[PDB]
Design a protein around this ligand. Structure first.
Ligand SMILES: NC1=NC(=O)C([C@@H]2CCNC(=O)C3=NC(Br)=CC32)=N1
Length: 340
């Protein structure tokens, strides 16, 4: 149960670098990585775009002294209350990051620390996330409202599935937070699963839940079960990601107030119209039977009836996948970002 000190966790890491910040002229460095701008601030960590050798990198900053103060209740097994700081959570996130090595997952290239401040060195995925959220999901702009073409979606889904194969099957890790935010894309254009901050190791293929992002949580979480199968949880979440990719919106879980949310998921049936339906009125093409055939296999309420990562991978939908679809999109999308 109890993980040790950070030192004990990183005691087996082979590329642990000693923290050295410094300032040369108007520029701020972290071990030769020049600080450009912060790409995204998640208020448990920030992600920093950096430069070293005419190459771009992305360095996830964590801070022990800031994280150990944030302390929520968890309630133990034994009546007597237990407390867990968000730093405890990071201890587990480290261990995980420390052993992800995969071409479909975001793998770190080295960890920089002084045992308080941590910087995790990742490759820079020039196209940020799969989609960006602001009152709704969009590709590039709020004024330009484009839908990711289906021929390209396939790749994205195929690519993440492969990630799933590695974390579930090779590593025995459940992601527990599959989200457009965490599905990252470069210019070339590969797609890699990232962010392991809710991830944990499975026990006989299962997890102990009520943790992640509410609209991406499976119906199981709303039964009297305590152990849910980890793989299928990730799969459901990918289903939501697909739904989001389809109609650029969250399913029945349309935010506003969240009792409506938690009371719907477990029993309410998902409506499957044609792309712009949900998105028409905050502005004032579409899809086929086969498209929904695949998404429904993902979003089945009973998880045992829900499609495996195995069956999904070898399905008729992804049979006609072409990486040239993802390549052109990613290369063109990158062209539009450069000066935006
Ligand atoms: N949730 C996230 N965990 C992460 O490690 C990231 C990264 C770091 C990987 N590389 C990049 O280039 C990124 N661009 C953007 Br936006 C975010 C990220 N996000």
């Amino acid at each position: 149960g109890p993980l040790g000190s950070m030192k004990d966790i990183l005691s087996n890491y082979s590329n642990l670098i000693y923290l050295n910040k410094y300032v040369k002229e108007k520029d701020k460095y972290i071990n030769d990585y020049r600080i450009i701008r912060t790409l995204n601030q998640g208020k448990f960590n920030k992600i920093i775009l950096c430069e070293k050798d005419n190459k771009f990198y992305a360095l996830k900053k964590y801070e022990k002294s800031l994280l150990e103060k944030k302390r929520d209740f968890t309630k133990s097994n034994n009546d007597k209350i237990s407390i867990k700081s968000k730093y405890d959570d990071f201890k587990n996130e480290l261990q995980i990051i420390t052993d992800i090595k995969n071409e479909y997952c975001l793998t770190c290239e080295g960890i920089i620390t002084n045992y308080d401040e941590v910087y995790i060195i990742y490759e820079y995925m020039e196209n940020d996330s799969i989609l960006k959220f602001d009152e709704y999901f969009f590709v590039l702009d709020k004024n330009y409202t484009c839908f990711i073409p289906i021929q390209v979606i396939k790749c994205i889904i195929k690519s993440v599935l492969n990630s799933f194969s590695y974390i579930h099957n090779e590593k025995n890790i459940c992601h527990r937070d599959v989200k457009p935010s965490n599905i990252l894309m470069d210019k070339n254009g590969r797609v890699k699963l990232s962010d392991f901050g809710e991830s944990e190791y499975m026990v006989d293929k299962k997890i102990k839940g009520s943790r992640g992002t509410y609209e991406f949580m499976p119906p199981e979480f709303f039964s009297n079960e305590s152990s849910y199968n980890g793989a299928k949880v990730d799969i459901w979440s990918l289903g939501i990601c697909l739904y989001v990719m389809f109609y650029n919106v969250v399913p029945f879980s349309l935010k506003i107030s969240l009792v409506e949310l938690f009371n719907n998921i477990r029993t309410k049936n998902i409506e499957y119209p044609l792309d712009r339906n949900h998105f028409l009125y905050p502005l004032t093409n579409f899809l086929s039977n086969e498209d929904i055939d695949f998404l429904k296999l993902f979003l089945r309420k009973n998880p045992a009836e829900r499609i495996t990562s195995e069956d999904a991978l070898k399905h008729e939908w992804l049979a006609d996948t072409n990486i040239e679809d993802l390549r052109e999109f990613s290369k063109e999308l990158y062209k539009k970002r450069k000066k935006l």
